[PDB]
Amino acid sequence: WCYEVQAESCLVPVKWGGNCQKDRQSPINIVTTKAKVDKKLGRFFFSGYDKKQTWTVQNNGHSVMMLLENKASISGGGLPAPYQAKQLHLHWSDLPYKGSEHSLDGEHFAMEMHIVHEKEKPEDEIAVLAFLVEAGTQVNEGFQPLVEALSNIPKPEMSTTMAESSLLDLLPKEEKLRHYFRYLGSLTTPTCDEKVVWTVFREPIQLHREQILAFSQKLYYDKEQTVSMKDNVRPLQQLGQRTVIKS
Ligand SMILES: COCCCNC(=O)c1cc(S(N)(=O)=O)cnc1Sc1ccccc1
Ligand SMILES: [Zn+2]
């Protein structure tokens, strides 16, 4: 399987297999005025998110990914149970208007960060937290260890160790995470299993444009380094019978 961009030089998204052609797929456009406010949707509680750890990050050929090894977890957020954190990864492009998987009222962001969690032992076995990323004038210092690590992992099957950092370092201030959207959907890469309760945070992370561009400048999808890693984004799927709600 591959993204559309890789085919312009494999199984493009409209041709994915598995559950990818089913009817409750992600990502989607969120029409914000149509997302009904829902009183059950409370703030999230983060556990282990503040902790400075040296994380390992890898280029897996589809993205860059940090292994979180159950070292953080979440509860609250309208979730039915606590979910343990497994891995963080990103989707991006190289334009201010074109790299998130979800869009808000039709606007795409320059990246989207997914923190994938799993129900602590059907439709909601997996909780993914999605954060939108846009340009700011300031270097986001919190993101610097990740950005710095990318030059050590240019090809797939490569991994490296980041300088000390916390998950919170990567995120908007916690008081700004109270507004979010929620819906039921799928993983956005094959086999696209329809098992995710999605959360998309309204408040975006701000990165320096060149911190964003550093993902496309340093990373490649292939050992031969012929295709820069960017536009690792699944096209939009239809909402269909589903509704989106918001806190
Ligand atoms: C982008 O890298 C693509 C490699 C394979 N896909 C995933 O890692 C993946 C993607 C998502 S996403 N794009 O947020 O929908 C969620 N979970 C997983 S892998 C996974 C699945 C279940 C539990 C832990 C990890
Ligand atoms: Zn993802």
> Domains plus CATH for the chain?
1-247 (3.10.200.10)
Contacts of 133 (CB under 8 A, 6+ apart): 90, 92, 99, 100, 109, 110, 111, 112, 113, 204, 205, 206, 207, 212
Q: Is residue 73 a contact partner of residue 53, using CB atoms and an 8 Å limit?
A: no
Rounded CA-CA distance 198/72 in Å is 18
Q: Cα–Cα distance between 132 and 188 in angstroms, integer?
A: 15
Q: Is 117 annotated as a binding residue?
A: no
Q: Which residue has the tokens 């309204």?
A: 202
Peptide linkage before 191 cis (omega within 30 of 0): yes
What is the CA(230)–ligand 2 centre distance, in A?
Answer: 13
Residue 236 tokens, joined? 């939009």
Residue nearest to atom 4 of ligand 1 (CA): 62
**How was this entry determined?**
X-ray
Cα–Cα separations (whole angstroms), residue 57 to 72, 124, 157:
16, 26, 11
Structure-token pair, residue 87: 């891995």
> Which has the closest alpha carbon to 113: 225, 201, 18?
201
Q: Is 246 helix (H, G, I), strand (E, B) or coil?
A: strand
Q: What is the rounded distance in angstroms from the CA atom of residue 187 to the CA atom of residue 26?
A: 7
- Ligand (nearest to CA of 113): 2
Catalytic residues: 62
CA–CA distance, 1 with 15 (Å, rounded to integer)? 9
Distance (Å, whole) CA 244 – CA 26: 12
Q: What are the beta bridge partners of residue 37? A: 246
Cα angle: 140, vertex 74, 118; to 5 degrees: 105
Smallest CA-to-CA distance from 193 within 107, 115, 111, 128 is with: 128
CB 47, CB 74: distance < 8 Å: yes
118's tokens: 């799993």
Find the 244 Cα to ligand 2 centroid distance in Å: 19
Q: Known binder of ligand: residue 91?
A: yes
Length of the chain: 247
Residue 196 CA to residue 188 CA, distance in Å, equals 10
Q: Three-class SS of residue 208?
A: strand
76 to each of 73, 79, 82, 190, 220, how far by Cα in Å? Answer: 11, 6, 8, 28, 37
Q: Which helix (H) or strand (E) holds 224?
A: none
